[PDB]
Symmetry: C7
Amino acid sequence: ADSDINIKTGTTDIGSNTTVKTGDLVTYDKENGMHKKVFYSFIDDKNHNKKLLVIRTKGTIAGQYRVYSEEGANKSGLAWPSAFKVQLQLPDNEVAQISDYYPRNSIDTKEYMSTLTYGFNGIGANVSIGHTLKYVQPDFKTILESPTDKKVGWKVIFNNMVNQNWGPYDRDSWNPVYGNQLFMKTRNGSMKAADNFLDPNKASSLLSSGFSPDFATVITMDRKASKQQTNIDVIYERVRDDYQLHWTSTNWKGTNTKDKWTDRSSERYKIDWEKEEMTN
Amino acid sequence: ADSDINIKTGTTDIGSNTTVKTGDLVTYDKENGMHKKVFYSFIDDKNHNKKLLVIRTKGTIAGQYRVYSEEGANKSGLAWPSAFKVQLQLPDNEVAQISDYYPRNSIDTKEYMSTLTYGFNGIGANVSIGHTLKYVQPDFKTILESPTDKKVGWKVIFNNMVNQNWGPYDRDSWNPVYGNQLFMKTRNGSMKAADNFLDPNKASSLLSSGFSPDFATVITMDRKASKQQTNIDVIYERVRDDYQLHWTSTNWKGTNTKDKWTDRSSERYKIDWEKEEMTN
Amino acid sequence: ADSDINIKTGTTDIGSNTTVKTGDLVTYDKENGMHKKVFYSFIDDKNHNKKLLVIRTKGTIAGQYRVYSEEGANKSGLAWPSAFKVQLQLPDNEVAQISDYYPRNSIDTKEYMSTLTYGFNGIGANVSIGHTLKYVQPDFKTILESPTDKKVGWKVIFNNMVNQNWGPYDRDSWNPVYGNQLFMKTRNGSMKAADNFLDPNKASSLLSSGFSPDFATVITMDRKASKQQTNIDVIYERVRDDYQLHWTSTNWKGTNTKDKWTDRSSERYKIDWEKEEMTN
Amino acid sequence: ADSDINIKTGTTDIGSNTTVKTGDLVTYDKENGMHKKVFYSFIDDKNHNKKLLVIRTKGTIAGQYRVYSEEGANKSGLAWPSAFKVQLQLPDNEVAQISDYYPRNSIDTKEYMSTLTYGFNGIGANVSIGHTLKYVQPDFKTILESPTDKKVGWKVIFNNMVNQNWGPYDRDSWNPVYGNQLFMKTRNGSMKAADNFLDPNKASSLLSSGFSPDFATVITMDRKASKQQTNIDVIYERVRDDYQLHWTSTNWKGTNTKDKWTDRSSERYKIDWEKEEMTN
Amino acid sequence: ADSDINIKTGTTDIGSNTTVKTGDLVTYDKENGMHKKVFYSFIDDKNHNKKLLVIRTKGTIAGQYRVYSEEGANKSGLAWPSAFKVQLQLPDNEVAQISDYYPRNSIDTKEYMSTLTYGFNGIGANVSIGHTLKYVQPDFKTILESPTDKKVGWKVIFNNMVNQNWGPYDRDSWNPVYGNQLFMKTRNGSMKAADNFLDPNKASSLLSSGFSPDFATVITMDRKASKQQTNIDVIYERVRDDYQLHWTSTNWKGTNTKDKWTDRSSERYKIDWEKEEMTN
Amino acid sequence: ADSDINIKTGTTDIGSNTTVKTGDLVTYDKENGMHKKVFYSFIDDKNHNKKLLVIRTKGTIAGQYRVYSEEGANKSGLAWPSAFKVQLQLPDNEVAQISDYYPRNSIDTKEYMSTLTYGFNGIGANVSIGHTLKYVQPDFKTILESPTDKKVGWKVIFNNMVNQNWGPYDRDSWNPVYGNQLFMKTRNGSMKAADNFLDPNKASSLLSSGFSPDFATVITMDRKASKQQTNIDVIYERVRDDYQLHWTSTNWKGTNTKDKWTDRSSERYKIDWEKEEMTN
Amino acid sequence: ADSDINIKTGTTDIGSNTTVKTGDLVTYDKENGMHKKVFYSFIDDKNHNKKLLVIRTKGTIAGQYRVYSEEGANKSGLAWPSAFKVQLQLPDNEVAQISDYYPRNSIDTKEYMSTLTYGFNGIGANVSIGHTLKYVQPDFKTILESPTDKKVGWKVIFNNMVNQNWGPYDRDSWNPVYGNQLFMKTRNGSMKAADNFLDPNKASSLLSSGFSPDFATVITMDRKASKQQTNIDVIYERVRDDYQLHWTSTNWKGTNTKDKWTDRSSERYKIDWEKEEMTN
């Protein structure tokens, strides 16, 4: 905060009195079902050392949460998204450099509560001691892959979910008899195996309705660069696990395998710094 | 935001120093009772790559929470809204594309609190470990259908609901003796079955009064397209369920059927980019 | 909201660079005791599709909370406002339409808490699982009746009220021995029936002091309409109830009859779009 | 509020590009100790169809919390401010009308919580059901008395108070042994009665240090009125209760009598709309 | 506040397009040790009825918390600030009046929570009807004492204090065996009586460090007045107490005497409205 | 709040339409490790009464938390910063004065809650009364020493600290078995005496990494003074304590000797009001 | 802030009406994998005493969390980032001085609570006393190393961590049988030693993905300096640790080594105050 260092607010900011040539590009990948969008703004400031270009990656990635296997009334499958990833990279040959990005990793806190109690009866003298720890855990965690000079990537992993108002079930949770109960409509059920799956409405929205990222990255050019034409690549992804239920003659049992499938988009864009346009 | 990435706030924004032409096309579907409004804008910033068009989707969908069946004093049925939906789409042959949309899927969080307590009842000894989980359950969930270019839609599904201050009930809730008690006024009642239903005032406002969507979508078209004219369709689907009450012998019984009826009200609007006006 | 789509704040809004002819109309209905006021503004934008007219229906509706009947010292009555309502409609033959009707309906929420604990005495064991549900109950809840193209109306109805720090005591609460105790000052009292009623100060303010509404509605008129003159109604209402106490020789009993009386006051205004003035 | 209808913020407000002639009028009623302050402002908008005059009713009403008389060492009295009022009447002959006023009645609220816990012991399986209800209780309630065309008034009443950090006593509380203990310093006291009252510092500030009003009443007058002059009357007043306590030879007993003394301070102001100034 | 009456925010305010003088009359009273400052501001608005003058009485009053007397290890004294005060007065013959003042008395609030729980064993069934009531209480209370036309005064009384986390103690707290133990370091102490006092650091800051007023007043004088000179007086009195502590041969006993000493300054200032300057 | 008296916000502030000549002076005291800094600003508003100068002693003071002496494994010492101080002083004969200072003593509040519970078995009707009191207590508590006319000084002391999640300890804490366990690693560890100390990271940051003050004072000097030169003195004194642990027979014993060493670093500045530069 | 002192907000700030030369330098270190950049502004306010320069330290330090060693299934190591540190120092020969730095050490707080209850049975009575304190402890705590005239540096250190929801573990935690369980997935399992480690996703984001500094620094120069060229060194760091799991033939045992590897990346930048550019 500039105001903390006695500097007038906004003095250190950039972009004053300088025109910006914004833009927009929309693409839909029918095969993978991820509507991709890239909102770019070309900021050049005569005061600033080098040109700027902020590249939003709004888009959206479909959940793709559906039962894919119908072996019978004894066992069935299910494929759900376990990680949405979008990463931008530049060719190693190019001279453009990634300067900033957002969001970024943040520290997480916890609340600690100690206790100590005395008691007198009548002639009892009971004593009690207790410690309670509280923290907030989201269903999906947004992570920023290690950003290097030429590429930055984000992830949205599946932390855990609450099923039928029962304790959160992690992706690797296991039970001695029932097995992993991540998506199990009924434990001691009698319907068809395909029917016995948690309704997509009850689950988190991201699983079935998809995830809509909003990530910002800014790249710069030496203002005296001999070449003013750099290509950039944006890659979307979706890692889908495999959840299967089978009947053990007494109760349903569920098993999960991690990173069963994966699909990418890999769109390539062409940046023209001289004319301040990015079309592809 | 831009301030966090050192970019002055509003630098990468659109619509500055450009005239915008708006409108408030409105319509009412008397048959389905869906007063639908469309408030559009035609921001045409010269710096931007493509033309813009922001289409608000204000209006309302009537709840239609009424008792329709009067088979007798022993049985009766009720019809209530289970999901309000509103959608936009463009013909495939058109070149305009859907760029953004404000209401979007968001991640949910839970507060997990552990515990551990041991005391001595001085000879004596005790130990206790506990886990607790907290989260908010909205009555209706505003989830966004998987969006694609030339088609975007929203839904408002029915989550669990609380009646008579007792435990929350949902569409699939079942009780072996009483059945689904979603809208059951009394258990050991003696008055007419049709009269035995939860008062609409006690229920959620959306069921009786109705739902008023407020969703925003923005369409962009190429600045040098061959034809500056596109047609867009807007739909206001509603889905209802059938809730049945009958006298088993000593207590009431509640049965619910999912997605019984459905009302759709589609209207086609014509967009004229050259004149910057939209006609219904 | 608007800034999430990267659009400049307030760009999609209207009413900029244009003069607005505000106004005010006040009237008092001595017979029904409701001080009704109407504040209007004419927003004529050259950019906007059609003319606008924003109606604020501010005013006040007297509570009228008093004992109306006095039949000896054994039983007496009471009349209190069950629900205040204000409506607004246009003649069918008119061409003006209702566009927006803020405030609208909102989605309720609740917090679900789940617990699970263990124990070990001193050999011994113990298990306890329990869930708690919390939510907020307003005394009066405003509802937006289904608005059509020509009429929109709000209503504020009676929810439960804490009496002497006791339970909710909603309108239809019944007790086998004491009966409905909504406004019962004392259970086993010995004073006169008429004087035995909850003091208006202890009760909610709206019951005895009145409800002052603030609802906004905007009606649009085609810019090239052949006839500019239109008409409005602006109807207020107040539905009372009858609460009676009688002595059963052992304790007081209370009974309530819903919607015993209804008094409504209407006054149609004339709109003059050409003059941009509205007269009562 | 206004921005939700897509109207730019402040578009529908008034007072733009105008010269409001404010003022001030201070009076002190040493007989009743009621400081008066009638800050006003004449908002003349050419767009608005009527003149405006917002009357701020600031001031202060002294608490007047003292032992008015003592009768021996076993009887004493105390007079405390039961309720403050501020009335702003307007002669029915005049044609000016009150348009708005602030503050106004607001809807209360309360949180409701429900519990359901059942455990097992090793096995005395138990079940527990419980519900809690919480709400805020201001010491003094600012109730807006039912307004009309020519008269608007406010009042501040005594909700209840906590005495010695034990019990929220009120005017209606009664205990068969000790009686009303609203301002009883000690139960089994042995001190003189005249000095057995709760210290004014421990009590609420408004009881002894006074209440400072803050109210607004905008009154509008027709612009083509025959005479541009309307006198107005503004009334302050407080209602005092006599709190008697005496010794029953075993313990102190206290009784409270409601509305014992009432003192009204009335002032008349002449308004000159043409001159835009009102004189004392 | 002002925007709720549909009046544009800041319209009714005062002080626009008018120049205002200021000053920092500052004095120090070495005998009483209270840094005295008076920041005045002269406002002469052509639209306003009168001429304003805002006198901010910010300053500082030393705590003066020390052991005043020492008469052997058997007993010792202590003097601490019981209450701070500050007030402004005008001569009766003057024509200036106090317009407004700040801060002012405020209404307290409390949270009241009810409860009701059932139970079943195995047989045995229990019940519970417990209550609860919580509120926030500052140790020092700032209450505006009744202001007359020529006089306004504030005070900061001592409400109560927490000693060694052993519950709140006030000036009237009494214990049969230990007596008033407000500032008692140890109960069964054995060191010197003077040494057995609560460390000033552990106590509240105001007791030993001082209090910094931030009060404000406004004075108005009719512009067409024969005499444009007025004299105003300001007082900064502090009220002390005695907390003599003595040993009863078994444990320390603390006794407190209320309002032992008092000291004040009473500086006089001269106001020159014509020159818009205030002379020390 | 200046807006609560109807005065327009910022009217009474000083600094409009004037030029302020700010500055900065940085100096580091290698002997005491205190990076002191002052940031001044000369404000001379012609509408004001006296020249102004605000001195912000930002600076920074090291922690100096290390074991000063060790004597075998039998015992060892430790020196930690007990309190940080910074003060500004003026010559006794000087004509400038201290007017204001931002950080000032503030009143502290504490919550309070009273519980009353009834019960009924089968029958054993029990009762329970409870008092709960909670408050927030920082580790280091800033205090403003009594400010006189010439010198104003702040102070930061050691309130208490939480060690190994155990009950908070303070300088005066004593335990008959272990003693003052403030900076104690293990109660009966077998490590070396010097090694058995709380890790600086586990302790508060201020103890080891220093304290960076931010205090503001404003100095006003008459504009007609014969001499326009003033001298200032700024001190950054810091007080350390001596903490020693001792092995008696089996367990470690800790003792604290408060106010052992004090480090002062005073520097004299010269102010030139005429040239508006403070240099030294 | 300045508002409290009656100084208009922003009056004492700097950087007004003066152009600031801005820039950005970005570099990546393949060996240590820490993407580092510095964002600088050359503020040259003519009113200010000295030329000013604000240096950011935005970037990222890779987590580097992987199993470095694999020695059969008996045991295997793991290296994780113990603390990320970034420094910034000037040569002792230079004359530029470090003025300020935004992130600084802050004082923490605790929420202490006290309890006291009474009980009565039937006939026996009981008493209880309780103390509880609450505080928030982040996983990573950023600490500002003691700054001086030339060198300034920050650090972020590993404070605590919750493993599998089973209490917080720190580097100093020890268990007599299991040992340090900081990153031990299963207490006893048949998997390989390398396989048995806490999944990086379950761990904190900083450990696996990395830490992104956002620190700020300010540097001043005498405006009359003989030379206008200053070299500055920017140093990043990452202190590693060694975590190893053994097998005692019954359960896994974990040992942690503190500060095993430290890899630091140093960069030297040259500043040209005349040209207002920091080359590289």
